[PDB]
Write a protein that binds this ligand. Structure first.
Ligand code: 1O9
Length: 559
C-alpha cells in the first residue's frame, strides 16, 4: 500500500520560521561563513513528501519467519508493568506540545484535575474502542545543517498530549525493557559512548578476518508496513501484561501505530499515513526491532557468516567474517536484495569495509588517540560540520534543545569538542555568569536537564579519565577537523588553544566546580599539565537509566 495519501492541503507551520543564521558577535567568533548555515522549514515539505510517498513492496520468507520466532521466544521472558498516571505524567517534558483539550505539559506534570481527567478518558476510550483511527498532527521538522557543495525538511507525526501520556502508561516499561531482552548485546541504546566503542572494537577483534558495513535504509519510517507494525505488536504481546495494558497495546497498534489521519497545524485534513509515525513512543523500539529482524534474516539469505548486528532504531551496522573480496561484495549485494524484499531498500548501496575506522554507524566512526601514558584508546568521533553549524545557530538564537551540550557530552573525547565546543561555550557562560544554570539537551532522544558545571563528572563516567588527556590524534581525524573549519570559516585550532588558556584561567579563579572544569576540561590547553585523578563527585552521581533505551520521538524526559 501507499505509505502516504495526500489531500492537497499543505503541511503548515504554527509560527514564523527562521531559516538563516543571524549576524551575531557571539556566533561570529565561532563561525564566520554564516550564510552557509541554514534551518529546514515547512517550505521544503513538499519535496520531502514526494520522496517518502510510494507503494511498498514486501515478500516475507522462511528466514524472516524463523528469526521472528526466535525473537518472540526471548520476548516471552519479559514481564512489563503498567505505569501509573503519576509516573507517566512525570515522564512528560516540561515543554511538550500542549493538548488541544485545555491543558499542557505543565498541567500534566502538576497532575492538574483537567489534565488528569482527560488522560483517564483517553485511556478508557483506548480500552473500549479498538478501531477508530486516532488523529495526529504533521509538521515540518526544523533542523540546522551546512549547505552542500539543501536537505528538505523531515516530517514529524504525533498524536495529542493525552494520547502520549497513555502510550507511556501502556508501553513505557515495554519499550525500555523488551529491546534488550530480545536483541541482547546487539541493542545499541544500552551503551554509553565508551561501551559502544568497546562493543565495536571487541566484535571486530573477535572475527578471524573482519568485514563490516553500515546499511542505509532509504527513508526507513515510510518503508515500515502495516505487517511490520503488527509483527512488532506480536512481539510486545509475548510479554506478561496487565489486561488493560494488553488492550491498550492492541488498540494503539490499530488506531495509531499502523496509521491514521494527518492534520496540519491549521486543523485541515492533510491525508493519510500507512507507515511509521516518527513521533510516538514505540518508534525507536519498533524501528530497532524491525531493522534487526530484517537484517538478521537478510544475512542468512545472503549467506553472510557470523553476522553481528549493532542497531539503533533505523541505524544499522553489521560486522561479520570475510570470505574474500569478491565473495563479500556478492554476499553484500544478496543481503541488500534480501532487505529490499523485506521492504528495507537502501538509500545508497552499502559498501564492504576491512577497516573498522572506515565504517560510519550512528553518524560516527571509531578513531584512535593516546592517553597521558601514551597508551592507545579508541573513541567515537564524526565530521564536526553539522555539530558546529548547530552550535553557531544555538549561540545566536535561543533554542529549547542545546545540541551543543549534548555533543560535548557524547563527543567529549574528540579533538573538536574539547578545543572548540568546550572553549566557545564556557567562555560565553563565563561572560554571562551562567555556569550553574541547568540547560536542556537530548541524548538518544530523551530530554535532560544538565548544569554545565557537572560536565567533568558526567564525562568521566561516560568516557573515563582519558577523555581529559587524549593527545596525538590520527592524521585523518586532524585533517577532517581542520578542513571542516576552513570550510565553515571557523578559526583554526591554534586560535582555540589561545582562547582556551584564557578560559581555563578564569575558571580556576572562581574555584569550586568552575575550577574543576578548568582543570579537567582544559588540561589539554596548558603545556605543564596537572596530574588528573578521579573526581570525587564523579563516582557517585546517579547516571542510571542514562543509556538503557532510545526514545527518539517518544516525548520522554528523564528526571
Ligand atoms: C545532540 C546529540 C547528542 C543528540 C542526538 C540524539 O538525541 O539522538 C542527535 C544526534 C544526531 C546528529 N546528526 C544527525 C542525527 N542525529 C545524535 C544521533 N542520534 C542518532 C544517531 S546519531 N544524538 C546522540 O544522542 C548520539 C551522539 C553520539 C553517539 C555515539 C558517538 C555513541 C555513536 C550516539 C548518539
Amino acid at each position: 500500500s501507499m505509505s502516504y495519501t495526500w489531500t492537497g492541503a499543505l503541511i503548515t507551520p504554527c509560527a514564523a520560521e527562521e531559516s538563516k543564521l543571524p549576524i551575531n558577535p557571539l556566533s561570529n567568533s565561532l563561525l564566520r561563513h554564516h550564510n552557509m548555515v541554514y534551518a529546514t522549514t515547512s517550505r521544503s515539505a513538499s519535496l520531502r513528501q514526494k520522496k517518502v510517498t510510494f507503494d511498498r513492496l514486501q515478500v516475507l520468507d522462511d528466514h524472516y519467519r524463523d528469526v521472528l520466532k526466535e525473537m518472540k521466544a526471548k520476548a516471552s521472558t519479559v514481564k512489563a508493568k503498567l505505569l501509573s498516571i503519576e509516573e507517566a505524567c512525570k515522564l512528560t517534558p516540561p515543554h511538550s506540545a500542549k493538548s488541544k483539550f485545555g491543558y499542557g505539559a505543565k498541567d500534566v506534570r502538576n497532575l492538574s484535575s483537567r489534565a488528569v481527567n482527560h488522560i483517564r478518558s483517553v485511556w478508557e476510550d483506548l480500552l473500549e474502542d479498538t478501531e477508530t483511527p486516532i488523529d495526529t498532527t504533521i509538521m515540518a521538522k526544523s533542523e540546522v545543517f551546512c549547505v552542500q557543495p539543501r536537505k528538505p525538511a523531515r516530517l514529524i507525526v504525533f498524536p495529542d498530549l493525552g494520547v502520549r501520556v497513555c502510550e507511556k502508561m501502556a508501553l513505557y516499561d515495554v519499550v525500555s525493557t523488551l529491546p534488550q531482552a530480545v536483541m541482547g548485546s546487539s541493542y545499541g541504546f544500552q551503551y554509553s559512548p565508551k561501551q559502544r566503542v568497546e562493543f565495536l572494537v571487541n566484535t571486530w577483534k573477535s572475527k578471524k578476518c573482519p568485514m563490516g558495513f553500515s546499511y542505509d535504509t532509504r527513508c526507513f519510517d515510510s518503508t515500515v508496513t502495516e505487517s511490520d507494525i503488527r509483527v512488532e505488536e506480536s512481539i510486545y504481546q509475548c510479554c506478561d501484561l496487565a489486561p488493560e495494558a494488553r488492550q491498550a497495546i492492541r488498540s494503539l497498534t490499530e488506531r495509531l501505530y499502523i496509521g491514521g489521519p494527518l492534520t496540519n497545524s491549521k486543523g485541515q485534513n492533510c491525508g493519510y499515513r500507512r507507515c511509521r509515525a516518527s513521533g510516538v513512543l514505540t518508534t525507536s523500539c519498533g524501528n530497532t526491532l524491525t531493522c534487526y529482524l530484517k537484517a538478521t534474516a537478510a544475512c542468512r539469505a545472503a549467506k553472510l557468516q557470523d553476522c553481528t548486528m549493532l542497531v539503533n532504531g533505523d541505524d544499522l551496522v553489521v560486522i561479520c567474517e570475510s570470505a574474500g573480496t569478491q565473495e563479500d561484495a556478492a554476499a553484500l549485494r544478496a543481503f541488500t536484495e534480501a532487505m529490499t524484499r523485506y521492504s528495507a531498500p537502501p538509500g545508497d548501496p552499502p559498501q564492504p569495509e576491512y577497516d573498522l575506522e572506515l565504517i560510519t554507524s550512528c553518524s560516527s566512526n571509531v578513531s584512535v588517540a593516546h592517553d597521558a601514558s601514551g597508551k592507545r584508546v579508541y573513541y567515537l568521533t564524526r565530521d564536526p560540520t553539522t555539530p558546529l553549524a548547530r552550535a553557531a545557530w544555538e549561540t545566536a538564537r535561543h533554542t529549547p534543545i542545546n545540541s551543543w551540550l549534548g555533543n560535548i557530552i557524547m563527543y567529549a573525547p574528540t579533538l573538536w569538542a574539547r578545543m572548540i565546543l568546550m572553549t566557545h561555550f564556557f567562555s560565553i557562560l563565563l561572560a554571562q555568569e551562567q555556569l550553574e544554570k541547568a540547560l536542556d539537551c537530548q541524548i538518544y532522544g530523551a530530554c535532560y536537564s544538565i548544569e554545565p558545571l557537572d560536565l567533568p563528572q558526567i564525562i568521566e563516567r561516560l568516557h573515563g579519565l582519558s577523555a581529559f588527556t587524549l593527545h596525538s590524534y590520527s592524521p585523518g581525524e586532524i585533517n577532517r577537523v581542520a578542513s571542516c573549519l576552513r570550510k565553515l570559516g571557523v578559526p583554526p585550532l591554534r586560535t582555540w588553544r589561545h582562547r582556551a588558556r584564557s578560559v581555563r584561567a578564569k575558571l580556576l579563579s572562581q574555584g569550586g566546580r568552575a575550577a574543576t572544569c578548568g582543570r579537567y576540561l582544559f588540561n589539554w590547553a596548558v603545556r605543564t599539565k596537572l596530574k588528573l585523578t578521579p573526581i570525587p563527585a564523579a563516582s557517585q552521581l546517579d547516571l542510571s537509566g542514562w543509556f538503557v533505551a532510545g526514545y527518539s520521538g517518544g516525548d520522554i524526559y528523564h528526571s
